[PDB]
Design an enzyme around this catalytic site. Sequence first.
Site, short mmCIF file in Angstrom:
data_model
loop_
_atom_site.label_atom_id
_atom_site.label_comp_id
_atom_site.label_asym_id
_atom_site.label_seq_id
_atom_site.Cartn_x
_atom_site.Cartn_y
_atom_site.Cartn_z
N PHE B 141 0.86 -1.18 0.00
CA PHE B 141 0.00 0.00 0.00
C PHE B 141 0.89 1.23 0.00
O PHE B 141 1.71 1.39 0.91
CB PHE B 141 -0.93 0.02 1.21
CG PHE B 141 -1.91 1.16 1.20
CD1 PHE B 141 -3.10 1.06 0.50
CD2 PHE B 141 -1.64 2.34 1.89
CE1 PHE B 141 -4.01 2.11 0.48
CE2 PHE B 141 -2.54 3.40 1.87
CZ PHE B 141 -3.72 3.28 1.17
N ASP B 227 10.02 1.76 0.90
CA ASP B 227 8.93 2.63 1.34
C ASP B 227 8.90 2.60 2.87
O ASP B 227 8.29 1.71 3.47
CB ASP B 227 7.61 2.19 0.73
CG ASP B 227 6.48 3.15 1.02
OD1 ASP B 227 6.66 4.08 1.84
OD2 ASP B 227 5.40 3.00 0.41
N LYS B 256 4.68 10.94 6.64
CA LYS B 256 3.91 10.77 7.87
C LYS B 256 4.51 11.50 9.08
O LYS B 256 4.22 12.70 9.31
CB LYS B 256 3.81 9.28 8.21
CG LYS B 256 2.36 8.84 8.36
CD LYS B 256 1.88 8.14 7.07
CE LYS B 256 0.57 8.76 6.50
NZ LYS B 256 -0.39 7.61 6.38
#
Lengths: 402, 402
Positions: B141, B227, B256
């Site tokens: 994702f 990632d 984030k």
Amino acid sequence: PPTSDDIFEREYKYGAHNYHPLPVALERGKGIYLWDVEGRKYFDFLSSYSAVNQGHCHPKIVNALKSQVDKLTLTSRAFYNNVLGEYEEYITKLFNYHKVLPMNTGVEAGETACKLARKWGYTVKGIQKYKAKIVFAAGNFWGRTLSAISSSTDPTSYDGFGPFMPGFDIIPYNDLPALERALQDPNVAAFMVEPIQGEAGVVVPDPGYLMGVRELCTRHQVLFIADEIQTGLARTGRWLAVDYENVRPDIVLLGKALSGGLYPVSAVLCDDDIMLTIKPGEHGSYGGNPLGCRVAIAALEVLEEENLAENADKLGIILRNELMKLPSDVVTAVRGKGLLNAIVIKETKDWDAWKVCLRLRDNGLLAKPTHGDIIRFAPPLVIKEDELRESIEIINKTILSF
Amino acid sequence: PPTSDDIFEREYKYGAHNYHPLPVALERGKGIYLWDVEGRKYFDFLSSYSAVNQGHCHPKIVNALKSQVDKLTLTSRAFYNNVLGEYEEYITKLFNYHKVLPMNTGVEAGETACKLARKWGYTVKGIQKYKAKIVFAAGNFWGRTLSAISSSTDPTSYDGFGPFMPGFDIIPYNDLPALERALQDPNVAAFMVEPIQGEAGVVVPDPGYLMGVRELCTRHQVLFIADEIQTGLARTGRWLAVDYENVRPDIVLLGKALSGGLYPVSAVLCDDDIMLTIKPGEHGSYGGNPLGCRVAIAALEVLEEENLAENADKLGIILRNELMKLPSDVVTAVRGKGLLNAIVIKETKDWDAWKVCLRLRDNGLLAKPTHGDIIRFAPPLVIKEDELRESIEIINKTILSF
């Protein structure tokens, strides 16, 4: 102590070379003015590409951000926050659409519009799955993702970046017969277009083009997507550019000025028949966080209370009238709407748009060329007539100094 | 006066239905705690999906944002600002890569990594143009753009969203033979993978998987893209998750927690041989704005000064030890690293992960299921041992209350 030369040379060593900015190093911004590290003062005639329509560091938006950052900034959409629904109601009632989907950047809102169009084409229009097409206009710009560059006709945008997203067709801008021909394919779900092509050089379509696009989209059961991320929010003299022709698009994309330059906030506005094709868990993102929602509420309130669309219209009329007094041997055309304008330069072996922007910087006005001959003029909508005429005098000095 | 029920019912009327959050309406956040509109207090064991690793509204990051918003927030990359180069030098020296490319959201950093990989495969590796492939791991994702869902094996992510980006291959996660088989194609430019699959349910690969991926990528001249947008920045007990195996990826994605939840900031870190394949004007975005750069500097400084990776490691050991004391008839597995953990629930006709999260909310702890049986536990890294054990007591009460 770090000078401008120290700044440039620093980025060149530690930052990616994906940009070539004008050699000026700003460290302060207020209203229409910018200040570099040497303390020099400049008029901002770029407005961060319409992101600071309300001026740099508007006190109302700054106060909203400061008040919200002390309370709550991000819960993620796994939980509810108290600000998102208030902001959603405000913006949906302001633009008269059933619902809004919040995202962060303009390209994300464009991606959302594409996914909405495809999902609606399959679940509502009945297109067999994964045959849905979206039509774009040549010269379009809506971001730098793989899909966004897949719809682009600019080689610098797509050259060298792998195979491209299928299902994106391209037709000429400002061309109603071409749109009518393209919409004969029943597998077309949508047509996405900018009411004024900003990044292409402030390309204004002919009068009646938006009405014709709406008529053709309605006639052939095709969704009209209006990318107002740069032209919206009082920049061209109305709330939306499409308001100049009383046209209601099926999907409206907002961004940039939506936050006054203080936070990445974007929005996708549309009615339930389109919006509710995406079900829970099927799309999302910092999207809809409370801080950005407070900031966006404050930015929209600033746009509405200070009547910035009317000021944009009046001062843009004045600016375009003054700019056309330049020599034809010097400026071949002046175009634009509201406070979004552009001049085009007869490039020779003696000068070009980059040198003109360098000299403008030397004379206290910051602008940037978009194609080596097209210079954008878009000061913040809070500018006054005397400030506008002083900056016009700066432009005259610079342009006649060659 | 607006209650929680007024909040929910408001969004349902004016917001898109792309989410189904847990019915709790927060309006305040501080450190490890959240407060809803009714004044009730909750432990935050979601951390906005690792976005507030430093806790909600960390005073240092808040002060950085307040100090920068009074000066300058956005000039666009058409001009230089004084903060971007400082932030770039700081982060490049912190993670030991030549350069960084700044973006806003995690999916934008992923798009940038894909474009870098393709451009490097063409201009450096010599792949014939638009034959370049990128390999992903099943369960991945990295966002909700058309490309991101094109690489997804989750039907709710891609079903109904038009034709998909070509050139994306998929192999099983935690599978070195499959990667070795896939990399036999010389047209492969990169392999993008999460060191721990967060959204898939905190799927931890076997020891040595990252070393094997690095060896296989180096052997076949393939770029290793890590990632770390969710696993990075002290969440798993180290600066990066790959540090658990002393592995240096070719490209590192951060986001984030990069801002502590106060601003959308993401970063793409890599060396010149990869970064300089993108030339001026060929990629960009609010990317690199001064406000987000100050916020990110403060967030990284908070991560480094307070030694949050060590606390994450210790308290995650404690949390996983305590969670495994639950009945096997109740919790079938506990997994994770640092303060990123997950339990899986034997779903029956009597309970499920959603009901467990509802009751946790009723007992003062906020979490959310990711697959109707997998519950995530990821409190902010500023939590202490006594607070951790009190929240563990809350979890025990809730889970044994069935």
